[PDB]
Design a binder for this molecule. Structure first.
Ligand SMILES: NC(=O)c1ccc[n+]([C@@H]2O[C@H](COP(=O)([O-])OP(=O)(O)OC[C@H]3O[C@@H](n4cnc5c(N)ncnc54)[C@H](O)[C@@H]3O)[C@@H](O)[C@H]2O)c1
Ligand SMILES: Nc1ncnc2c1ncn2[C@@H]1O[C@H](COP(=O)(O)OP(=O)(O)O)[C@@H](O)[C@H]1O
Ligand SMILES: [Cl-]
Ligand SMILES: [Cl-]
Lengths: 339, 339
């Protein structure tokens, strides 16, 4: 009995995201919004025989969309095309995020905002600074959705074990690999830090360990390449988004998350153990990081810093490389709002 | 565990259908095929952390797609769109289904073939007559997926009870309404026959009963209008197709179906109780109809005619209207192949 709003519901990620949300038993009302086509998508989903009402809204009805929404998912954004650089992509997506998050601050300021659009590293700071200007920022209620990195880590860990030690590989369940790997950091390239917490599995991977790390880090490129440079992960991104959203929704329902060490990109200074986590990643002013979180009533109430205590030596070096680049991605987002 | 192939995986229905199949615990390998883009969607999907291996294939690689496939879903087709007549759609889909079913006959002749392409009423006969010419027709292995009509009936029964009297409406779970409604007949307009098997819900509907029947029959039209002409159901059809497939997959693993009186459009003369079904619908030569099926090892082994035994008077009229129209649709399909 959570009301969920999806902003950007007609897009490549948004459609399958809206479908997976419609299937959740934790949702009572699903409201879909987009500048185009959301009413028809809503109507199509409304035929599905699960116990949630689903309505889509036209471009002028964002207030009806958001009214009393407890959770707001934002996969809105512009897709890559000829003549649009990564910096154009950034600037248009930053304008979209600014505008959507402003609307949340106006029409549903108590909502948990789950930012799915990319680049997360910069767009989450944009969301936070947009809300601070408005006096509507609650640190536990803004989460960058980084879960696709964990999902990839769980899948590739098993793929590399199959390839390397078939007997150990055959023993693994891709759906429970979160017990053995945790992914922290940012959401792009070398900001992504996969931490295998079971050292026997690091042993079993042998010389595939670095290939594994590279593959989780550059997973998105593998799809962009598989799609001839024309698109990126849509379906797996919608999957990872809905899986994270479900963990958030379970917390309204007094249920423990199914994912061990579930991570999200969050505002460290405003959250319990955030200071400790800044100390552990070796940068005392770094404002954002994806780390394990504890949810209560849909809100992040503290950061679990366990994983950072027990880091291997090589993991320490990944963390340092990530932090360097993440500081600049954070500042690029901050300066979009602060100028 | 089960190998599944999807032919037409890149489309409107195909993509989210492929996503939902990727999530199934009954699937060991998922192979995706289309005239464009299947490699890239398969690769996207392959990052999802569920145990199936998922690979997409280029337009020249249907043999590799089909090789040792147990279940083949065919959401391939041309959907409704302005400027296309009913007859244009039939002819374009007929050729697509003939060609794909030929390829099943050649490369995976033991597969269960689930036709999602519309119009089901005519395209399933085309699939059957195509297989018959090749000597590769097994009656229990060719099913028209009509399941969206049951999905709509379960949804709309709850929505209409919720207006007529909230007290009974609220006691309903959409997800288990198949205990109270079964849909039979064909898959278009007035071929569609919703049978409320609980008489006390019929009572509670009062003069919404005819509105309910009509909404189930014309659900397709409702989405086309909500999408302003731009196709019909995509996401709800992917949901319905995945649900049906799952009942098929479940039967390989010796497990009871979760859907009471699950229906599909099947070839009556090749199946146990099909002669009895023909007599009950009042046409001793009708070759196809959508009725509750019993599955064993992914194949229909009998038809359950219970629902036809105690039809209301008014249900009797729906059945008679549907059979008239069905006979024509079936004969249109058969003539496509038989010239
Ligand atoms: N069973 C139902 O209740 C139901 C409901 C809705 C839609 N449909 C039907 O599903 C079909 C697909 O609809 P859509 O909205 O996905 O259309 P779409 O145009 O979005 O997708 C169709 C896909 O089929 C592909 N295709 C065409 N010919 C092919 C071939 N020979 N081999 C492989 N792929 C081929 C196209 O490349 C495309 O990717 C249509 O027939 C539509 O009428 C059925
Ligand atoms: N200000 C906005 N508010 C809501 N939706 C938006 C806004 N700007 C763009 N969108 C939508 O976001 C969606 C993005 O989807 P798409 O361009 O297919 O790429 P992807 O989901 O892969 O990023 C589109 O449906 C687009 O209309
Ligand atoms: Cl609010
Ligand atoms: Cl075979």
């Amino acid at each position: 009995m959570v009301k969920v709003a999806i902003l950007g519901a007609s897009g490549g990620v948004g459609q399958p995201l809206s479908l997976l949300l419609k299937l959740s038993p934790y949702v009572s009302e699903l409201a879909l919004y987009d500048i185009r086509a959301a009413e028809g998508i809503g109507k199509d989903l409304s035929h599905i025989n699960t116990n949630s009402s689903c309505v889509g809204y036209d471009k002028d009805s964002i207030e009806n969309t958001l009214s009393n929404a407890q959770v707001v998912l934002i996969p809105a954004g512009v897709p890559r095309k000829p003549g649009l650089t990564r910096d154009d992509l950034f600037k248009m997506n930053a304008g979209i995020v600014k505008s959507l998050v402003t609307a949340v601050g106006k029409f549903a300021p108590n909502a948990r905002i789950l930012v799915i659009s990319n680049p997360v590293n910069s767009l989450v700071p944009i969301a936070v600074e947009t809300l601070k200007k408005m006096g509507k920022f609650k640190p536990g209620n803004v989460m960058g959705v980084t879960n696709l990195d964990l999902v990839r880590a769980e899948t590739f860990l098993v793929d590399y074990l199959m390839l390397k030690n078939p007997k150990i590989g055959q023993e693994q369940d891709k759906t429970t690999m979160h017990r053995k790997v945790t992914v922290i950091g940012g959401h792009s390239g070398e900001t992504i830090i996969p931490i295998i917490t079971d050292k026997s599995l690091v042993f079993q991977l042998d010389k595939q360990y670095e290939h594994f790390i590279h593959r989780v880090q550059f997973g998105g490129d593998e799809i962009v390449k598989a799609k001839q440079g024309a698109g990126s992960a849509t379906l797996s991104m919608a999957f990872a988004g809905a899986k994270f959203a479900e963990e958030v929704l379970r917390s309204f329902h007094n249920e423990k998350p199914e994912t061990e060490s579930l991570s999200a990109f969050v505002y460290l200074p405003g959250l319990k153990n955030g200071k400790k986590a800044q100390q552990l990643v070796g940068d005392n002013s770094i404002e954002y990081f994806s780390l394990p979180i504890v949810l209560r009533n849909g809100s992040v109430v503290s950061i679990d810093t366990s994983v950072l205590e027990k880091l291997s030596p090589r993991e320490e070096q990944l963390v340092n490389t990530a932090v360097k680049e993440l500081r600049k991605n954070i500042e690029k987002g901050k300066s979009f709002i602060l100028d």
